Amino acid sequence: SHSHCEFAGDIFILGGANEMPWEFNLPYHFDISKAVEHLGKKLNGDYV
Amino acid sequence: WTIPQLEEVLKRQRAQDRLFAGFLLHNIGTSADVQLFICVATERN
């Protein structure tokens, strides 16, 4: 039938060979709202 | 359809053009079915 999708963005993270391994103990927020409406949906819509 | 009147039907069937798909299958150990899906452009489903 179809599968309609749009590109959102790119996120870059540093990483070292000898780095003291760590975890982000808190979540990170990134804006996504650019293309959810471009996909023909409202902010409270459904998507993946 | 007895013998002397189906050969022309077979000739007609061969004369009209056809499309086809090919397989090279072998033993798998358990009898099973095969399903064909025709993916077409629009993404792809």
Descriptive overview:
The structure is cut from a larger assembly and holds 2 copies of chain A. With 48 residues, chain A is largely without helices or strands. Chain A is 8% helix and 0% strand. The first copy, chain A, is built from 1 helix and no strands. Chain A has one helix at 33-36. Chain A is elongated, with a radius of gyration of 16 Å. The two termini of chain A are 18 Å apart. Chains A and B meet through loops of A and loops of B.
How many beta-strand runs of chain A? 0
Radius of gyration of chain A (CA) equals 16 Å
Order of helices and strands of chain A: H
Inertia-based shape of chain A: elongated
Major interchain interface with per-chain residue totals: A-B, 5 and 4 residues
The biggest beta sheet of chain A reads:
none
Total helices of chain A: the number is 1
PDB class: oxygen transport
Keywords: Glycoprotein, Respiratory Pigment, Cooper Protein, oxygen transport
Entry title: Cryo-EM structure of N-glycosylated Pomacea canaliculata hemocyanin
Chains A, B: Hemocyanin
What's the quick description here?
The structure is cut from a larger assembly and holds 2 copies of chain A. Chain A is low in regular secondary structure.
